[PDB]
From a paper:
Recently, two isoform enzymes, ChaC1 and ChaC2, belonging to the γ-glutamylcyclotransferase (GGCT) family have drawn attention due to their ability to cleave the γ-glutamyl group of glutathione, resulting in 5-l-oxoproline and cysteinyl-glycine (Cys-Gly), specifically in the cytosol. ChaC2 exhibits a 10- to 20-fold lower catalytic efficiency than ChaC1 and is constitutively expressed and involved in the “housekeeping” GSH metabolism. Despite their low sequence identities, GGCT-fold enzymes exhibit a similar structural fold for their catalysis, including a YGSL motif and a typical catalytic Glu residue, as well as unique features, especially in the vicinity of the active site, which specifies the substrate repertoire.
Numbering used by the authors:
A (entry chain A), B (entry chain A): 1 to 82, 84 to 177
The structure:
């Protein structure tokens, strides 16, 4: 099966994937409304990471990865499509390359119901919080930069108003 | 986290593991009571694969694998310890090497409640069914041989009465 990576997976490429395609999905928008206490932040001082939200006019550029078929032959691992703030569903992924027809992919999403969801907030604020945060995975700012730098390698900044704006405010903070 | 492989994982080594240790666990016994329709058998002509059953006098030799920390920084993947015929729990794993202290490991088990559970049966029968079966993964007999040959590389045949007996009956069938 193929899964869509709208975040860290884009650049955190050290995992096993049979194949990958740059592309985009629809009807969702990428927002930094997901709190991070185990990666780019910690409890008591959470960081912000991305999640996808339903947006009819929405688009999200990212990368689709083909997971290797599982080795354990004794149990049937399953997919639960429902589940406690994290959603699993599928959506159409459009490859950047027109040579490939669009195909279904798995989407793993953290909902408004997940415990870590921080929700929408003024960008001024999100940027600062990101500025300050650091977690087991690294600093919050590095996460944003990679993503942003990461997306730019694939599309014009117009593609993600929210992400690039954030990057810019942060860079400004880094100034003063 | 570390997971215990009592089956195919022992020899199907083409996956990513940070580390591995030969060892054994207790209070469970390995039996060929699990039906296979997606690996070593198919619907309408199922094969047999191993599952672990609670056995107070029981022991299971196998290998423990250290899974790599997950790359996705956006969602919290969880462990559900309860779940529809497959159980997830932990048990003590004793390394063959005394230099290492015993440690907890994850055990993923298919219960009597799973749909594919075929249950106990006369060994004469299981061997034949295995003889005949083939699935997406390969023939049923190859699965048994690898396991058996696989275990022997780690312990005397006395360790697994059930597995080696089965191997032998099968080899006999292969004769006539």
């Amino acid at each position: 099966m193929w899964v869509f990576g709208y975040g860290s997976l884009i650049w955190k490429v050290d995992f096993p994937y049979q194949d990958k395609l740059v592309g985009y999905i629809t009807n969702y928008s990428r927002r930094f409304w997901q709190g991070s206490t185990d990666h780019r932040g910690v409890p008591g001082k959470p960081g912000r990471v991305v999640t996808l939200v339903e947006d009819p006019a929405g688009c999200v550029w990212g990368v689709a990865y083909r997971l290797p078929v599982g080795k354990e032959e004794e149990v049937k691992a399953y997919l639960d499509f429902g589940k406690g703030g994290y959603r699993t569903t599928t959506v159409i992924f459009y490859p950047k390359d027109p040579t490939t027809k669009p195909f279904s992919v798995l989407l793993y999403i953290g909902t408004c119901d997940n415990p870590d969801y921080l929700g929408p907030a003024p960008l001024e604020d999100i940027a600062e919080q990101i500025f300050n945060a650091a977690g087991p995975s690294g600093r919050n700012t590095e996460y944003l930069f990679e993503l942003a730098n990461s997306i730019r390698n694939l599309v014009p900044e117009e593609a993600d108003e929210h992400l690039f704006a954030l990057e810019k405010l942060v860079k400004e903070r880094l100034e003063g």
